[PDB]
Design a protein around this ligand. Structure first.
Ligand SMILES: Cc1cc2nc3c(=O)[nH]c(=O)nc-3n(C[C@H](O)[C@H](O)[C@H](O)COP(=O)(O)OP(=O)(O)OC[C@H]3O[C@@H](n4cnc5c(N)ncnc54)[C@H](O)[C@@H]3O)c2cc1C
Lengths: 486, 486, 486, 486
């Protein structure tokens, strides 16, 4: 009843530097979650990403009632600023203790939020939660922002001062009265998909308590061989904690500590593989930090994301091709098993997001905004930076890699990410007897080894809708339309 | 170089009562395997059942060379009797120590084999390996054979004398010379399927050494709850050792001992569930013993198997329906996941052989000899009795159960064998988001819960080729053709 | 109420070939245990060996009530023959189904028992339980008994016929009425040691159910390295099941089966160490079988045991020396830790029975009947053959080994049985800092390394009562009294 | 070659805030260990405490060479200040980066060290390593130090600001040249006890790498039931890490973090026992922090330790009584097993230091400086504060507990610390058969239960040198000499 913390994307109580700075403030703290998806514009957050919030908020209530604090109130309005001002009015609070995000749509909203509340009479203070450093204090030589990643992260490990350690969770807090503020339940998922969304719990359980159980099971397990099992998609040794790390159920400053703390343990035991796989796991953590630093600084993705160097190219406006690739009647088996895992789990491996999405533009030749709006709706780790950073990288625009005029060609795009075919036979079991040479290209197989395996192309497994040698040249008939104008 | 043992379907060295009776015979023993599939008539043994033999023979050689004995010679001819007489001629042997099988095609061959060898001058002696008792010494009240199972097996546990215990494996044997007999390698699998058959090793490894590893992993594991997990097909708690138990890699007299020996351990520990699941596991072992006793005695399946009370009914002669059911474009999802597991593993659960095969006759209305000849070609536990006993039982003819004029109706044929749908979503992952009420019948679902789950019937998942209410009456238009003639 | 089985030293229900031959006999069986220790003469069985029976009988009652059978009646009289005749009179039984033992005091009693019962009118039948073969059917070349062990056991593995396998335990039996026979409880242990005997349960739990738990924990565990950890006494890798194997709680025919059954498993896995340690474990089992065969056949230990080639030698008649060696104020540390383990556990390692008992005769020069009567009173595996076979062997009389005119000399009698000193420091912790060179001989140590370790000889740890160089010649002053008379 | 760190009692590299503040200082760092035990006066550190340093320094060299840094130089002189000034002269260093200890003998030495080096021209800076807070910033109400513990530690958990978290270990450091400074090996242990000290490695391995292996094995293990297994000495569930925590191989700020971090994990799982045993483990950690705060502040143990309210009382000057209690010929079995564990392991439980030391003064009536000088010589966790705080507490002088005019009386001083007698029978196995009522007092036993257990008092187990009812009044004849003078 003195200060408020309102969570936005930090759904945790361990080392949260707005709740722990509320416990030692002396007065009473009441928490909050204002839900306004109409403010976020075209980035109405997901459809299974909206499922994760409703099960993580209810996990946060029973984890924060045991520290005291009564409840976690949840209000709903069109914009945050009317609802948050009505919250300090209803409760009679003096401060607002939030922490700044780095979306280009919330950064304009946060200074607009700090402009409404401070002119009223209450005082606010922002903090730094889901980032190692802050993106304005990391600089290059003179004063500028970086424009690449490998010059950037070489400054990020060789800082003058180390990142601040995970500060202690609070001992106990107090709300005073749990009934002055009339909280209300609110819908997140639709009523037609009230039962079809509960089938994502076969692989994913949300909550902050399951975030550190998933972290510690990775440190003892697959971190010792992350340097070699990084690309292989058949085994689940790739630390499936990015939905925890996107919604702030796991702090980046704790994963940076515990990996570095046990890098020293393996460093003086002669394990040269397990110490190499710790500098390569923190590099991937730095890719998350670089995407937040990119949308805040100089490029900024100035008005909308999915933007670096295109949006003329003569795409086919065929909706039924978007009905085939979404369903998976595509014939190319590696982009077909990846398109079935995304629907069944709400999850893909990073190298399988490489081949599913690059097939969507370079072979199928569809507009890339149809690929984002489908990835945005059914995925769990669907943020505004990394979905914009990754689509930028795979379809080709950072001077980092994965250029155009280059189709996937799954003959050798599969022998690096899936050597034995344990990923194709897991997800399309109608292809489970092809002897691992034609499991990545059944249309290149002779008729004798196909009729022996029980696959008749056309009835059991569909033909490729677009041939590989066709779109190897049909792209260059369309990509030359860039190179006459730019 | 004195006596010969020739293995037929007892590919093991532990408690084999023809090899152990060859070690204590004093002289030298040479083993053999004569392969004549042209003698077996229409029962040319399998196509993946022929894969299991080629990998179990080579497992038997390296397991019997370490007892001595030099080699395991393998000859090939049209009939066994010319090849076996040429074997005692080439090696100068005096005895033949085999053990009698119980196929109606080998029982006529065995007395024909004993008729050729004894008239030459050499002496033979048969033994009893793959059976608990012998089928002529188990009798009913006066002198007759039984005609049912539950009167039969009540005599089989209440015998005057117990079955003979597993006699010790031999200490060491000797062949003398490993080069007098010019052995030859021989083909089992085709050259077109030399690589597609090696993909059954993802679930099955043959050999007698893996038979007791699979047995002991079941006694400590799923035997404690076999009485409740008997019908459920989603979990693999059903002791997958019938391909070991068909080819004689695991003796029935050892499984009867070790289950009964540890039934006593659980009997005086208060475990009333784990002692009930031992009388129900030996009952299923007795179903194997009853099928061998049935083809030898009174019914005998007199000239051919797949025979009890039919073969008029007006079947559709449509080959493309046999191309749909073999592939699995059938729409009924429970008989579709079962039709994909049979092709991927060469294995089905016993209650899934119930619903796949009864759909083949009572709904699709195809001739049952097309169902045997497909089951015979791709299955591992494809014998001559139990494939004939089971097709007789499920399609309805023993006074045991599973009568006609009764379709499967998977609305409640699935809630006993697959309660949560973990078996359908494992094998058809294009149906992985239906909320477990319409996972067994997608065509009975409303359009809203189907478009939310991403299934559009006709493109993603095919329609039912034959409706359920159609064949519920279209059978009775065809089954009345029995009841005017019989 | 038709036949009786009376247990003597076969306190088990698994593969007991008098109870299982009572179940299939048709009539009702009542079990019994007649306790007459006054018949056994000087071999009144033990004082902790009498503790093991009272806790194994009560374990047998609750293990045989669950098969039916009502009770296990226990009567007490001076001789067995009056009590057993009063038992068939009280119950009206027709047969007596026991199994013959091989003590020279029970073999004369058994034919005296068969002489009383058969002349009355009832019929008896003996069986073979606690032996592999029978000692009259194992012969040498012409017709004679053997006189050694290594010629004997070479016949015992190369028999014409294998030993009979473990026959199945009974399904269920029936006593009919549990109150016609007025059974009575009876004392085994004294009332002064009613509480001091319950402290042997810190290491030993009796019963037949714990016999196979102790057997299977050895087969998976220390049997793979029994060939190298056979002599080392510090680690408990030596299969502590001889108290189970003496009282018939574990059949010898089952241990011969399960070791031989899994010798084949390790034989075709390349484990040359684990297959050697199975031929050396069955050799030690054969030492138990040889001692039973020795007291029945030609030497017979004709009127009393502890007898092969002595009982003149001029022993000291000092009782206080027998008070020192029993207590352990002896100074020699290896025979002192062994004398403390025997009192604390009722158990010694076989190589520690070697050095404790040979020090008792060759150095202390006491009469050997004081050593048996002390070993008989406090030990668990105190039978009439192996206690007589072992004292015969270590003090020297079989042409097998461990001759006289040879003291122990623990300088190198310890570096084979206890290399690091983990056995001395476990049992005399007042010596726990001597640096493993003088842990086996503290009196041979300099004064500086003794005062640094905190041992002052005379107050903390006593001096040797008899010097080593004294009894190295004082024996030969007494052993020359043999060699003038024999 | 720019700054030096010299370790004193912080033998670790993880979160050491003088080495990590040396890595980010830019220049080159060389480490050091100056060994001057002649400066410490009567507190020449231990004889097995001197063994722990020689094996932890050599563990620190191979753990700090892999971070770079060349070596760890070790010089020896009479005082630290001549040797440390000769070290900055030999290497040409500019700074000295140490961290202040809290002994009253080093606190006078540290400001004397800062007085020599700063007047030369080099600059020093101290840090805070082995303490949670600093002892001058924890205050009571007005400005004073505390005089008790329970008022003190209630301020220590309710501080305004939390203790600083474990700061990251260094990435890599550099010495430049490893041969400019002529380092020398040095003796720690005597040559007479070069081999008797290596027998403490049966229970203790030193080093900082084994400190966190011992910590994490306690957090997963016995911390869940520390609240009930705190007093019981028979089981080793009491987190044996005080020799790691005394020599600075494990930071107190890390144990405070990891216990508090997983107190939250058990707090929201319903484990009310495992969350109570975390507030009671940090209390014991606070007892270490209170003893350091006590010798620095107001009482200070002004010129020497072992000092609070005595040193007149008429002690017996008998050296042979000090030869009995050191050896353990004392008859009282609970103080005898504790006196054998201290010699065998160099370790005692905290409640066994309670009864061994209080028997030394209140019953044996010896001067307490003979008890410290014996505890100082053979113990591992022999510091200057807690050895002074504990002797003060048990023999009675803090207003905390354990007053005088109160003997131990092991009849009920044993049924709280050793209920079954598993601690007495472990260490005096000559008493291993007493039936747990007279295992704590054999002289109070009747003769029948003693002769049955094999204990004859006087020869096997010695009599009590001082009777219990004697020193219950003979103390009060000597304690009245206090109460006439004070
Ligand atoms: C002086 C002396 C006295 C002995 N007194 C007894 C006694 O009272 N009771 C008794 O049962 N054994 C006795 N033995 C035999 C030997 O000590 C036992 O084998 C002992 O129990 C070893 O136990 P174990 O389980 O470690 O043997 P293991 O290594 O496990 O051997 C398994 C079995 O082998 C048998 N066995 C092995 N070695 C011998 C042997 N040398 N003689 C006889 N059997 C053997 C035992 O019955 C044992 O159950 C005595 C030996 C000596 C030298």
């Amino acid at each position: 009843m003195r200060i408020v913390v309102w969570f936005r994307r930090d759904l945790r109580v361990e080392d949260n530097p707005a709740l722990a700075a509320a416990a030692r403030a002396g007065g009473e703290v009441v928490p909050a979650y204002v839900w306004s998806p109409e403010e976020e514009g075209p980035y109405y957050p997901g459809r299974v990403s909206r499922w994760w919030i409703s099960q993580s908020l209810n996990h946060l209530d029973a984890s924060l009632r045991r520290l005291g604090a009564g409840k976690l109130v949840t209000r709903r309005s069109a914009d945050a600023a009317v609802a948050l001002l009505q919250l300090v009015r209803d409760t009679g609070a003096t401060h607002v203790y939030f922490n700044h995000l780095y979306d280009p749509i919330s950064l304009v909203r946060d200074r607009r939020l700090k402009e409404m509340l401070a002119a009223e009479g209450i005082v606010v203070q922002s903090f730094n939660s889901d980032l190692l450093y802050e993106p304005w204090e990391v600089v290059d030589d003179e004063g500028q922002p970086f424009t690449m990643f490998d010059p950037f992260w070489n400054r990020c490990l060789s800082m003058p001062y180390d990142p601040p350690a995970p500060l202690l969770p609070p001992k106990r807090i107090n709300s005073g009265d749990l009934s002055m503020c009339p909280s209300e339940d609110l819908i997140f998922e639709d009523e037609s998909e009230r039962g079809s969304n509960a089938l994502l719990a076969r692989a994913w359980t949300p909550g902050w308590q399951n975030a550190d159980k998933a972290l510690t099971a990775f440190l003892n397990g697959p971190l010792a061989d992350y340097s070699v099992n990084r690309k292989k998609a058949d085994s689940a040794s790739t630390s499936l904690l990015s939905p925890h790390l996107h919604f702030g159920e796991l702090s980046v400053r704790k994963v940076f500590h515990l990996v570095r703390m046990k890098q020293l343990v393996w460093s003086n035991e002669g394990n040269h593989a397990a110490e190499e796989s710790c500098t390569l796991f923190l590099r991937s953590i730095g890719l998350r930090e670089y995407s937040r630093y990119l949308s805040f600084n100089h490029p900024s993705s100035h008005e909308r994301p999915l933007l670096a160097h295109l949006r003329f190219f003569p795409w086919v406006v065929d909706e039924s091709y978007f009905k085939i690739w979404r369903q998976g009647r595509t014939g190319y088996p590696l982009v077909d098993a990846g398109m079935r895992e995304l629907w069944a789990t709400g999850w893909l491996h990073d190298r399988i997001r490489v081949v599913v999405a690059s097939f969507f533009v370079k072979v199928l030749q569809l507009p890339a905004r149809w690929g984002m709006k489908y990835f945005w709706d059914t995925l769990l780790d669907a943020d505004l930076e990394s979905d914009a950073l990754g689509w930028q990288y795979i379809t080709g625009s950072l001077p980092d890699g994965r250029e155009l005029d280059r189709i996937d060609n799954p003959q050798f795009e599969g022998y690096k990410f899936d050597p034995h075919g344990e990923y194709v036979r897991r997800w399309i079991p109608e292809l489970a007897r092809l002897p691992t040479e034609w499991i990545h290209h059944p249309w290149d197989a002779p008729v004798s080894v196909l009729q022996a395996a029980g696959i008749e192309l056309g009835s059991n497994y569909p033909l490729p809708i677009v041939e590989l040698d066709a779109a190897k040249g049909r792209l260059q008939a369309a990509l030359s339309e860039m190179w006459q104008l730019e």
